Structure formats: C-alpha cells, structure tokens
Write a protein that binds this ligand. Structure first.
Ligand code: AMP
Ligand code: AMP
Ligand code: CL
Ligand code: CL
Ligand code: CL
Ligand code: CL
Lengths: 481, 381
C-alpha cells in the first residue's frame, strides 16, 4: 500500500549520482531532494495544504522538476498543464481539476487566472523563506499523484488520475523490457507535461538514472548533448527521429535505445534507421497508461512493419467487438490492462462506466492482433468512416497521401454522399495534380478508400497536442482538381 | 492485485530465450511452460486441486523447477522441504503446513511419508497420460506462492508465507539494485529449497534471464559452466567464495552475491584477483536479500551488510524507540518483499510485527552514513 518517497530514498541511497543535467547545471539526487524539499516548504507557506491540488504551467525547466517532486512531498495532487492550451482551455482544466493553485512563472500571463486559483511564481517563490516542514516520507501506492488531461479530438478533455503505483509499475515494467545499467542516461526533449516526459522523472529517481533535460527539441543541441553527456536512451516522436537521420551518417554510439512514441513509422524511415544503426523501439501507450504499455524491439522493425509490438511485462492487451474477443486480424477496439493503467478518469462517471470492463480499459483505439500476438494500431474509433458498408480508417489514407513527395500534411474526413464518402485535405511543398495524386492512391489503396475530392490548405486544424481535428476540416481553404 | 503468470507471459513474450541450463540440456521458456503445464495436468489427474498444499522434496533438477511452476499453474501452495533435514523435521513440516501431497523421487523413501501425505514420484508422474486442463493464468499478488520453514535454532520452525507479490517485489528491487542485461545469466549451485536458490527461478521468468543450474557445488564443474555459458551473476556462500578464489576471476562474471555472515582476509583477495563480491543481508522472511553492499565499499565499510534495496526499509530499535547511530538495538525490516505472516502462528505474528515492521531477531547498528552493521541474534547474549 506504500513505499518510501522515491526521491527521498534515492537521495538516501545514492546521494551523489546525477539526477538532472539541464543546460549548464548538474543536480544530484541529494541536491534535488534538497531543492524539492525547500520548494515544498515555500509552497507550504503560501497555504498549500496536504490534500490540495496545485496545477503546474511551466516550460521544461529544473524548477518544474522540483515542483512535481515538491507536490509529492507535501501530498498535493499535481496537475500538468499543456502550455499551448488557449486561455479558455487552461481555465476549463483549472476548474475541472479543482486546482486551488497555479504554479507558473513570469513567462505566462499569471493574472489571467487569478480569479479562480491562487497564482504563484516559481522564481518569486524560491527566493522566500518559510518554516521548514516534515515531509511525507511515504507514497501511498493507490493515491493520485498527478492528473493529466487527454487531448482527443472528440469531446471535452478528461483528467487521467495517475497513481504512484501506476508510475512505479510503468517504470519497472519498462526496465524489464529495456534493461537498466548504472551507465544509463535518458534525454528528454519532449514536454514534461506529456506522459512521455513526465514518466522519465519517475524512472530517474526509481532507477537512480540521470535525465538530461532539454526545454525544446533542436537536433544539434541534442546531438551535442548526447555526446557531451553520453546519453544511452532518448524519447522521440517521428519528426524528431526524421531529423536525427538527416543530420547524421550513423547513430551516436552512446545511444542504445530510441523510444519512438506517437504513431507508426513509415517503412523507408525505419529501413534507414536500421541501415544507419538506429535502435528504434516502436511503442503504443497513452496518458491513460502512464506512457508505453506495448513495445516493438528493433530486431522486429522490418519484419513486423506497422506493428506497435507486444505488451510490457505485467501488462495485457486484447481486441473486442461488441463484448466478444476478436480472432487474429479481426478489427476491434484495443483494450489494455495492467498495474500501470490509470485509476479512472477524474470526475467522469459516464466515461468511466463505459470505458471499463472487468479490470480492462477500453482505449478508444481500433486495432488487431496477428497470429503471434503483435499489435497493429488502426486509429480512433471516433474517426471511423463507413463509406460503403465498409470501414475507412483516415490514418491509412493520410499515410499514403503523406508518403507522396509533394504532400506535407494529410487529413481525411468523411463527407456525405447518397451512398458518406472520403475527402482529403493536403498541405503541399511542391504542386501536385489531382490526377497525379489519384493514381498514387490507385496503386496503393482499394478503390472505395480513395479520396473522392481533394482540398488544399496552409495548415490543418490541430489541437494543443498537434493532433488533427478531423470534424473541422470543413472547412478552411480552397481545394481544386 | 493480479499479474499474469510470470512463466506464461514470459513464454508468450520471448519463447526461445533460454530459461534453464541444466547439465547437458537447455530449456527455453516455451519449453519450460510446456513442461510445467504438462506436469500440472498430471498432478491434477492425481486429484491435486486448486487451493491445496503440496510439498516438494527434490535435489536441484530441471524437474524441481517444473514442479514449482506446476504448482503455480494449478493454484497450489508449494512447500519446499530441506533435503538435508531429518525425516522427522520433515514430517513436522508436512503436518504443520497442511500438505496433502509430497512430490519427491526414487532418491527418497516415500514409505516414510505416506502415513501422512499422498506421495507422488516426479519421474513416474511424468511418464503418465493426462487430460488437458485450463491452467491458472493469473497470479494473485496477495496469495501464498510458497511456504518455506525457518531453520530455527530458536525452537519450533515456522512456515514463512511468501506471496507472489513478495517474490515479484524481491526480484524487481534486486534489479534496481544490480541492473539487468539481456546478456545476463545467473548460476545457482545452491539448494533451490533455500530462498536464495528459489528466488533465481522467479528472477529468471520475470527478467527473462537464463538460470545455469547445478545440483551441487564443485569448483571445477562450476568454473567450466561459468565459461562455457558465460555466467554473469552467481549466488554464493562464504565457503564457495574461498574455494573459487583459491583456484585463481572470470571476466564473464559481473556479480557474486554473497549470503550468510559478514572476513577481512577474504575480501581483499577478491578485490585483488578481481572478484565483484556483493555482501548482503536477507532472511527467509524477506524472500531473499533486503540489504546489499556494493564492491565499491567492501573496504572500508567492514562488517556492514550495506544499504536497503529500493522500496525497502531498515531501522534499529531498542526499548520501544528509535536508536541513534551507532547505538545498538534490534534490526527491523520493512518492504513489499517482506513476508505477510507466519503460517498458523498467531502468537509469533503479533510478537514479530509492530506496525508494518518485522522484528528481525538480529541485533545491529547503523553508521553516520546509514549503512547496516549486523552483530548477532538477540537470543544469545
Ligand atoms: N504507436 C502508436 N500507433 C498509433 N497510435 C498511437 C500510437 N501511440 C499512441 N497513439 C495514439 O495516441 C493516443 C495517446 O495519446 P496521448 O494520451 O496524447 O499520448 C493513443 O490512444 C493512440 O490513439
Ligand atoms: N550478513 C549477515 N550477517 C549476520 N547475520 C546474517 C547475515 N545473513 C544472514 N544472517 C542471519 O541469517 C538469518 C536468516 O537466515 P535464513 O532464514 O536461513 O536465510 C537472518 O536473520 C540473520 O540473522
Ligand atoms: Cl543501477
Ligand atoms: Cl475502475
Ligand atoms: Cl532420481
Ligand atoms: Cl550456452
């Protein structure tokens, strides 16, 4: 039911291992526990009470790391806010979460939220003095540690309640998938308010592993940093990976693991990764699962094109259609289970009752398993297009459209015909003929899947997580033929 | 509260990794799961049902490993009997544990136990046909997996109830401690009925790590195995460590896990000849080690057990209050790898547990830097 605070214990065990390398600075676990302890004392001074909820609105900085751990030490549910949310979107999550506080800095417009929560400035806060406190030495495994909002393109975002046990099991289960050395160091250049970034902070204290932290992704800063600090592990999305490949001949020899999240990698991209010696682990997972729950090892990259792999140890997946488990290759909804799967959505009775079934979580993702149990992810249930009687998965068409030389971004929505039909929306680099494109699709897609008409834009309607909002491409800009 | 069966999931994930190296043979996890499922189907034919208690009396053999897993797959508590005990020490434990079965072989006299339990001969048992069964695909974390008796110099042995949870957390904590590698291989030449040998079996299937198994310890056979199979981890008692060092330390070996008492002569020859020896403190109650001392500290934290594994806790108490460094007191352990309760010992359970902590019955102190020094059991003084 409880473990010692990971940071306190990590500090007690290996006080002088590096916890955080951030720009110039290095921070030891002892230092990090010290920083975090005093920040907790300062928050304690501003009336932040055990059992409260503080929201965090910060770019990737050492202070954000301290704030997360400080909340832990005070016993305060931490809400991680996407910094690219609109003012309105932030306000909703502040209200919905029941935050009493917003810990932000001068880089945001604090006063915009003062009317609903007690705003606090990470840097103005740190200067202060306060009565020292006796910290929570124990984490309760079933307590909500962090709340994180989903960013699906359907509906109002849901707060995922992630327990200390969730995070612990995520970290452990991942180490059994990837192994762990004392020489391991992990580069995080993704936001810490997304679970790919946040979970690394917990991997760190639990493994006693250094996290090298970048505020943003810039390929040269990362490559330098990789070499300056002997980085063995990096987390990436497809675009960060594409950039690493074009900026290198071979893969930096320090790197032993590239954890690719977000979506599949197109066949040419992986094939070069194998050629240039890039050890790419593809993965599937979500906010609901506290980072990855399924992974594919490099040695299966080409052999299992399009697969997210197999579940981590202690975890399970299955595929279901109307209450019944699906045969191999039969499309259905992906369901997940394991000690890393979230408690429940916060304050969402309807979604909870609908998304759970006997300890399994319904992910909202469509997919299937092949005979060996590898998982293939189709994309969201909600974006399904039944054109004929048959199903159309937008991610499939977008993929074929995107692989074209002249296509920059592709989006597929289901319009109407006296028979729903598929429409494409292409951002372009070069110009491209609708005949030149229809025949690219002809070669690569069943006829009924191919986009009826084509539209063109300069940008496609994305939410604050860069996710394509399909319901809304009707419309923005002008499309020809 | 539940995990899929470690062996089943491990066989699903990496079917052809080597589970077991024993003598000639090697057994893949797919094979280990097939063998353990078969044996479990054969036990079921002999009326061994879910919720029963089976004792196991065997030397280190591949067949013992199957038996352990067959119990898990059946939902059957496994009692591991020390083969070097007297028959009556064994009969006491069979009665105490409520075993309905004893799995053993020709090496032992079955007729010596059958007036109390049904006896089953592992090798005859295997030769038999059996209908297929629906195995137990989940381990409940809070259920007893194995019952293992205390080697009590302090009176009547107690059955340590070791949960699936305890074993898992023990294996996970140790990994956080030592690190784990695909290339890692662990040699066991110690008895499987002691927790030090048993726990490798669980490490094996949770990590997906090969265990190199050895019926007994003979320096020549062990060093030949170490090299032929590139062992990286090995579990050893004080005696075995003297014997191996006297015959020279293989580059292949990365960790030597030492168990039992704390010898200033001994350790430096290890450092010199190049032995990465990890000193440790554990008990049956903690389902393996709960404290370890890295080689980086042998000199000079002399006489120290080391520091608690992650998730695990160590304090030192006298009267009913916390001692200070370095003031002596009774060592008390705590953590998810620590046994819940002794089997059918109401008095000893309240005696031994003060608020989530286990009174260890050993005395010791912590230094300024919080390392553990273990002195002697409080009993004799
Ligand atoms: N490997 C993958 N392949 C396809 N879709 C993915 C993959 N990983 C994540 N996703 C999508 O991203 C969602 C998780 O979103 P988030 O909570 O924002 O990380 C999942 O439900 C999937 O729909
Ligand atoms: N390094 C050590 N120093 C002192 N006593 C030990 C050490 N290792 C094990 N023991 C004793 O062995 C007991 C458990 O032995 P066993 O239950 O047979 O594993 C512990 O309670 C300790 O008292
Ligand atoms: Cl380590
Ligand atoms: Cl639930
Ligand atoms: Cl025999
Ligand atoms: Cl071999």
């Amino acid at each position: 039911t409880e473990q010692p605070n990971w940071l306190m214990q990590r500090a007690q065990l290996t006080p002088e291992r590096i916890a955080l390398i951030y720009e110039d600075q290095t921070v030891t676990f002892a230092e990090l526990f010290a920083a975090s302890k005093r920040m907790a004392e300062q928050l304690a001074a501003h009336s932040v009470r055990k059992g409260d909820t503080a929201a965090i609105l910060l770019q990737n900085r050492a202070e954000m790391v301290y704030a997360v751990h400080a909340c832990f030490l005070l016993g305060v549910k931490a809400v991680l806010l996407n910094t690219k949310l609109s003012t309105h979107e932030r306000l909703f999550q502040l209200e919905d979460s029941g935050s009493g506080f917003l810990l932000t800095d001068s880089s945001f417009e604090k006063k915009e939220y003062e009317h609903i929560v007690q705003t606090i400035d990470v840097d103005e806060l740190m200067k202060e003095a306060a009565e020292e406190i006796e910290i929570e030495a124990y984490m309760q495994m079933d307590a909500t540690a962090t709340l994180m909002y989903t960013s699906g393109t359907t509906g109002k975002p849901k707060g995922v309640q992630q327990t200390f046990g969730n995070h612990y099991f995520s970290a452990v289960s991942s180490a059994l998938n990837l192994g762990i050395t004392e020489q391991d160091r992990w580069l995080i250049a993704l936001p810490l308010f997304h679970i790919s970034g946040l979970s690394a902070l917990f991997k760190s204290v639990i493994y006693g592993m250094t996290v090298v932290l970048h505020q943003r992704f810039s390929v040269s800063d990362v490559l330098h940093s990789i070499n300056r600090h002997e980085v063995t592990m990096i987390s990436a999305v497809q675009t960060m990976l594409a950039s690493l490949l074009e900026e290198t001949n071979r893969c930096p020899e320090s790197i032993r693991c590239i954890l690719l999240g977000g979506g599949p990698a197109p066949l040419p991209l992986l094939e070069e990764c194998r050629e240039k010696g890039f050890p790419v682990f593809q993965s599937y997972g979500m906010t609901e699962t506290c980072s990855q729950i399924v992974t594919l090892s490099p040695e299966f990259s080409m052999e299992k094109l399009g697969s997210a792999g197999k579940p981590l140890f202690s975890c399970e997946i299955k595929i279901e259609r109307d209450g019944q488990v699906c045969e191999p290759y039969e499309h259905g909804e992906i369901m997940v289970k394991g000690p890393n799967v979230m408690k429940s959505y916060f304050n969402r009775e309807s979604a909870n009752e609908a998304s759970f079934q006997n300890g399994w979580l319904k992910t909202g993702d469509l997919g299937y398993l092949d005979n060996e149990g590898f998982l293939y992810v189709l994309d969201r249930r909600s974006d399904l297009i039944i054109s004929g009687g048959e199903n159309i998965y937008p991610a499939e068409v977008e993929s074929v459209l995107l692989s074209h030389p002249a296509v920059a971004e592709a989006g597929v929505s289901g319009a109407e015909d006296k028979k729903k039909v598929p429409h494409a929306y292409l951002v372009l680099h070069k110009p491209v003929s609708a005949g030149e494109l229809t025949d690219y699709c002809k070669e690569r897609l069943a006829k009924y899947k191919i986009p009826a008409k084509f539209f063109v834009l300069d940008r496609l309607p994305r939410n604050a997580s860069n996710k394509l909002l399909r319901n809304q491409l009707k419309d923005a800009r002008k499309g020809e033929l």
